[PDB]
Structures are given as structure tokens and as C-alpha cells.
Design a binder for these strands. Structure first.
Ligand SMILES: [Zn+2]
Lengths: 129, 151, 87, 184, 81
RNA sequence: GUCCGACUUUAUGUCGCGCACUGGUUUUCAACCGGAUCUUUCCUUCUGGCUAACCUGUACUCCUUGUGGGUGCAGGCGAACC
């Protein structure tokens, strides 16, 4: 049973990147996947994706440009207080100069730097760098 | 590809066409289709056989495309929906058949295990239909009382 | 990479695979750099003027080096319809 | 009979459209016997690029079946009478906002009255003679969205140049840009 | 393979793949208009019919259930819908 | 504007760190956060307060003939507040 759909999407992205491809076909295509890929676009780790209406949860075709090296979900969307954001960034991101802990706040799904700018924090979705 | 109660992994199914609206070539009327559905139900047919008949002998791709309502929903609007939902009824029919086969020959252990599987499935479906209040909250499946519902 | 003064401190910016945008390791002893000669009007290979494609060792080992070179040469106007973007 | 076929406060431009409807009613054997039971909901004008214009008639909508049955003929006759103005037979549907967490209970909002569903119905009825056979959505790198609609190659001959007016109408109604493409 | 279109694959590849596995999943079946030599009524039947379909005018079967799609009768003439 | 580092018992003219304090910051800029507004786009709304405020027009205009500006009483703006 597909429990965490975003996990499947990011796993497909990782597999299709490690093999060097430039495209992925993510099947279930929820809101959260769309927002995750939109954040990745805003920061450039992804290219030009596409939603394919099925009337059936839709699908997504993702274009890459090799700039990304790893996605990944934190499957238990831990409640992250504004104090623990730095802890997650240290534990997940490889360096302080880049990388982004994509986390879901009451103000939408945002990268950790943007959430720290709004001075709001919520649950953690995943990480990209 | 789950096959809840076995090791199967098949995905044999049907792909509903993208267009929800009526097919261009269909000339029948929605009111006539609903009348046909009502007549078939009055003949004593479950919704699945009604859909099969409308797909084979007539141009009805599916009721929801043509009318806008589902077959069981259409029957319920006219008050012909059976007191026991069709899939659960067929499960009880199968269970009573296997129990008959068992009580007519004891040593068959494989059919005993299959009866256990069927009863587990019956319990699951009954729990679902009970949490949606289709069945009364006192409704339960019992081995002795299943025959009366089947018969 | 960049010191606060703005002076570069990196030893060298590495090349990147022209087909997968992945960088080329210093000791990546499988990667290649193809040179394709520019051609003038009468088919004379103009010397010292060409176009270079750095194919990584990874795609070469995988088996997609020739396909990537086909696409990459078709994009920059070297081969006519040798590669179709829709398989 | 100008006033009866329009259930809204009068406006000078729409009176001419109603008069054109009466002139359509003049012809008996096909444009009558169904067209009597007709109304309006404040037809509106949308500017199109190049000086073109798109008039959009607004059906009450409990009767979109009759308008759909009549639409092709009425469209071509109205284009004959109305030069340079493309006529589009749009629905009008009540879009409801959500109960906000701090808001108060009203009733279970049916999904048919929601923004996405209403927009889907509007775009599906932005062109009756053809049908939508595919919907693609591409989010550009710069952070803007486009909603490609793939239409049947069959019956495309009706919509030959109305594609741009459809784009303009949808953009004016929503702001969500759109690009039409016909698969081979 | 490394670079390849999925939004617009070749229609030959579309007929190649399985149903439920296309970009948008669409059935491979279709309907037919069959005429039985008996009367002039045109009956609409399914490619993969499951019942001994007969014309309402005459008790003559026009299809036959089969593990796959319908096997028509000998002298009935059909046109694809 | 303010001015301070090279000119040394002093500075300005000078060499500008490209302004060490404080502004025009609609100079296009670019954001980084908000707020109100139009969508068939609601944010709990009234019921009296209190009418805070001018869509009030009653007596009218202090003053350049100028809606800059008002003394002001019945309708009437309530998120400006009880
Ligand atoms: Zn016959």
C-alpha cells in the first residue's frame, strides 16, 4: 500500500537522477508533490515539470538538468519547533552555505530559510540539496 | 496487485475512459436508460448484472456517464436497493455453500481453511457496511443464521 | 568558492559532463572529450577550429555514450535527424 | 418580446442581442419550437487582441441542455449578424468560498460550486462543438503556470480561429493563461 | 533513453504498451453495430461482451462469450463504432 | 547634508575609504516581510451605544473667483471602538 506518496515521488526522482536521466514519471501527483517540486524549481534543483490530468489523481512528468543530487522525505512529519530548525539543517544538509529543509508551515510549504524569514515553523516534509 | 487473502499479484482490471460525458455516438435517452434499469431491477437483478446487460445488449457504456447517477444510487432513489449489499450477499452465499460442502464431508481440510478465509472476508465487509450504517449496528454474521439470509 | 574580497580560492573549476551536467572527477579514468571538426562550404575541415563535448565515464560505462553524443551533435546542427526526441 | 428573453436589468448592448434572437425566431421550422423558452444573465464583452471582440452570453444554467441543442446554428447565424464579434455560450455558476477555521457553519458546500469545478465546467463549455480529450499543466521555470488543453482532431473545423478568442476569454475570466493544442 | 519524451510518445508505442499503463489510460475495447440476416434492426454490442446477445425481434444469438472478446455468429455483419 | 582617513605643531584647495553620522529613499531598481482592496472572492453578524468618520444637506462659507479649508445639525460607514 502506498502510504507516503511524496516518498515514492522523491525516490523516483533520486533513482532517475543517479542513473543520469533528464525525466521522471511520478504517478500519484498530490498537492504536496506539486508544492515540493515548485520549491525545487524556485531554487533550481529541478527543471520544467508538468501535470498530466487523468481525472484519476493525475500524474507528473518532471524534467531535470543534473543540478540536483538528492531529494528525500522525512517520513514521520515531525513537529519542528522554530528552535529545532537549525538542528535538522545540521543533521540533514551537507553544508550551511546551501541545501534546504523543505517544511510545511501554516503559511504553506516552504524552504527552511523562507520559514525562518517569516519567523514561522511547522512540520518537516523533506530535504533537497 | 494486493490480493488481500492470498499471494496473488494480478492487476487485471478495466480502464474507465477519460471522457466523463456521454459518448458522441449514443442516441438513447437518459430517462429510457433509467426505465430500463428499473425494469431490470424489478426482474430481480443485482446492479452488476444490470450494468453488464446495459453494456452488452445496449450502447450504455456506464450509467453514470449517461444518467449522472450510479446504478445502485438509481435503484435506491426508487427504493429497490436490497437490504443486504450485493457483494456481502454473494460472500454469504459462498460461505453457506462451503459450509454445506464441509458438513457433507468432514475430512476436507482445504475447504475448511477456505471457509475460514471467506468468513474473515465477510467479517471485514460487514464491519465496513456497519460503520457506514448501511446495515443495522446489531447486524452480524452467524453460521446458523446465514442460511436464512441466503435462502 | 569565492573569498569575501571576491578573489577565487578554488584550485580549479572541474569540467562537467556535456550530456548529464555531472562534474568530471580528476581521476575519472574513463571519461572522454570528443572533438568534432568544423566544416566550411567546400568540405574542407578548417584546422584548429572545432567543437568539444565532454562525455563522462558514467554514461560510457552504462552504454549510452553514443546515444548522448548523437543527441548532442543533432542539437548543435551536426547530424540531420539522426536522433528523435520521442522514442 | 425583447424583455421576456432576458431576465436581468436592461442594457443597451444586450437589447440588440435580444433583437437578433427575435430575428432568429423569425425562421420557423428549425429555429422555433424550442427557442421560446430562453433567458439571459447579463451577456458581457471581452476584448480580444488585434481589435477583435468576444461576446459571452450567460445562460441561467438549469437549461444548458436546450442552449447546447441549439448552439451551433445560433452561433453561425449570430456571427452572420454580428461582425468581428465571436459569440460564446458560457454558463454562470455560484462560486462559494470555504468555511474558514474561524468562520461559521453555513452548510456542506457541494463540490460543484467550487472554484476548480466551476472553472472546469466553464472551460468545457467554452467550446461546445468540440470536446476536451486531454488536460496538461506545465509550470514554467520562472514560476508561472500554463494549462494546455488537447482537443479532438475530429470536429476541429468548427473552431478554426476561435482558439485565440477562447484564450482571451479564459484569461479575462480567471487570469490563468491557456494554450490550445490539437493532437495528431 | 537518457533523453526522451514521455508527454508525446509515438502512437505505435501507445498501442504497444498495456492498457492501464499509457499516459492517460484508455480502454482498447470498442462497440459494434451488428446486423443479423433475420431482420434489419441494428444492434449495438460490446467487443468483449459476456452474454449471448440476441436481437429483440428474433431469438438468434449474435455474440458468444469467450475468455477474451466476443466471437460473432456466422452470418452477422458488423461495423465498428 | 554631515564630513573623516594621506599633510607632517591646523585646516580647507587637494589624494577618496568610494560617506566613519543622517535623508531624497516612487532613481528604474530588485527583493523580505506585511495591510487593504476587485473577482459569482467575506473577515460571525446584528442590536443598541457613539456615531468615531463625511455617501448626510440643513443655516452657511472663514479665506485669492479656487472642494486647500471649515463652525454643523435628522437621515446615515460601525471593525475606529463598546
Ligand atoms: Zn431477426
Amino acid at each position: 500500500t502506498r502510504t507516503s506518496v511524496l516518498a515514492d515521488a522523491l525516490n523516483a526522482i533520486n533513482n532517475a537522477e543517479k542513473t543520469g536521466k533528464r525525466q521522471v514519471l511520478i504517478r500519484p501527483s498530490s498537492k504536496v508533490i506539486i508544492k515540493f517540486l515548485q520549491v525545487m524549481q524556485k531554487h533550481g534543483y529541478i527543471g520544467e515539470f508538468e501535470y498530466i490530468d487523468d481525472h484519476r489523481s493525475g500524474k507528473i512528468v518532471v524534467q531535470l538538468n543534473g543540478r540536483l543530487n538528492k531529494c528525500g522525505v522525512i517520513s514521520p512529519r515531525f513537529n519542528v519547533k522554530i528552535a529545532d530548525v537549525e538542528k535538522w539543517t545540521a543533521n540533514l544538509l551537507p553544508a550551511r552555505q546551501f541545501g534546504y529543509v523543505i517544511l510545511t508551515t501554516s503559511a504553506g510549504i516552504m524552504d527552511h530559510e523562507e520559514a525562518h524569514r517569516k519567523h514561522v515553523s511547522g512540520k518537516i516534509l523533506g530535504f533537497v540539496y | 496487485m494486493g490480493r488481500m487473502h492470498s499471494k496473488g499479484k494480478g492487476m487485471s482490471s478495466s480502464a474507465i475512459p477519460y471522457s466523463r460525458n456521454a459518448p458522441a455516438w449514443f442516441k438513447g435517452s437518459s430517462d429510457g436508460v433509467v426505465e430500463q434499469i428499473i425494469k431490470y431491477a424489478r426482474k430481480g437483478l443485482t446492479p452488476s448484472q444490470i450494468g453488464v446487460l446495459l453494456r452488452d445488449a445496449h450502447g450504455v457504456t456506464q450509467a453514470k456517464v449517461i444518467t449522472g447517477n450510479k446504478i445502485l444510487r438509481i435503484l435506491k432513489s426508487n427504493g429497490l436497493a436490497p437490504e443486504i449489499p450485493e457483494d456481502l450477499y454473494f460472500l454469504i452465499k459462498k460461505a453457506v455453500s462451503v459450509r454445506k460442502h464441509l458438513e457433507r464431508n468432514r475430512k476436507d481440510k482445504d475447504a475448511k481453511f477456505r471457509l475460514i478465509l471467506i468468513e474473515s472476508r465477510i467479517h471485514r465487509l460487514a464491519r465496513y457496511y456497519r460503520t457506514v450504517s448501511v446495515l443495522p449496528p446489531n447486524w452480524k454474521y452467524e453460521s446458523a443464521t446465514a442460511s436464512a439470509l441466503v435462502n | 568558492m569565492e573569498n569575501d574580497k571576491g578573489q577565487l580560492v578554488e584550485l580549479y573549476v572541474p569540467r562537467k559532463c556535456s550530456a548529464t551536467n555531472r562534474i568530471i572527477k580528476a581521476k575519472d579514468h574513463s571519461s572522454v572529450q570528443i572533438n568534432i571538426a568544423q566544416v566550411d562550404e567546400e568540405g574542407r575541415a578548417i584546422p584548429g577550429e572545432y567543437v568539444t563535448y565532454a562525455l563522462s565515464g558514467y554514461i560510457r560505462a552504462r552504454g549510452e555514450a553514443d546515444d548522448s553524443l548523437n543527441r548532442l551533435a543533432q542539437q548543435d546542427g551536426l547530424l540531420k535527424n539522426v536522433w528523435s526526441y520521442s522514442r | 418580446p425583447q424583455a421576456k428573453i432576458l431576465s436581468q436589468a436592461p442594457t443597451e448592448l444586450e437589447l440588440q442581442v435580444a433583437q437578433a434572437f427575435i430575428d432568429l425566431e423569425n425562421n420557423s421550422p428549425e429555429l422555433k419550437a424550442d427557442l421560446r423558452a430562453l433567458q439571459f444573465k447579463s451577456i458581457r464583452e471581452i476584448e480580444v487582441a488585434g481589435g477583435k471582440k468576444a461576446l459571452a452570453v450567460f445562460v441561467p444554467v438549469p437549461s444548458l441542455a436546450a442552449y447546447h441543442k441549439v448552439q451551433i446554428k445560433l452561433t453561425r447565424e449570430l456571427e452572420k449578424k454580428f461582425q468581428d464579434r465571436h459569440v460564446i455560450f458560457l454558463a454562470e455558476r455560484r462560486i462559494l468560498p470555504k468555511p474558514s477555521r474561524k468562520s461559521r457553519q453555513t452548510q456542506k458546500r457541494p463540490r460543484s460550486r467550487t472554484l476548480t469545478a466551476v472553472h472546469d465546467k466553464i472551460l468545457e463549455d467554452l467550446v461546445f462543438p468540440t470536446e476536451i480529450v486531454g488536460k496538461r499543466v506545465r509550470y514554467l521555470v520562472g514560476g508561472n503556470k500554463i494549462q494546455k488543453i488537447l482537443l479532438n482532431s475530429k470536429d476541429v473545423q468548427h473552431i478554426d480561429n476561435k482558439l485565440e478568442s477562447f484564450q482571451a476569454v479564459y484569461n479575462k475570466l480567471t487570469g490563468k493563461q491557456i494554450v490550445f493544442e490539437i493532437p495528431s | 533513453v537518457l533523453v526522451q519524451d514521455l508527454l508525446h510518445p509515438t502512437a505505435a508505442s501507445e498501442a504497444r504498451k498495456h492498457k492501464l499503463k499509457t499516459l492517460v489510460q484508455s480502454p482498447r475495447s470498442h462497440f459494434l453495430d451488428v446486423k443479423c440476416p433475420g431482420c434489419l434492426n441494428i444492434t449495438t454490442v460490446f467487443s468483449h461482451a459476456q452474454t449471448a446477445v440476441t436481437c429483440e425481434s428474433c431469438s438468434t444469438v449474435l455474440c458468444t462469450p469467450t475468455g477474451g472478446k466476443a466471437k460473432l455468429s456466422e452470418g452477422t455483419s458488423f461495423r465498428r463504432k
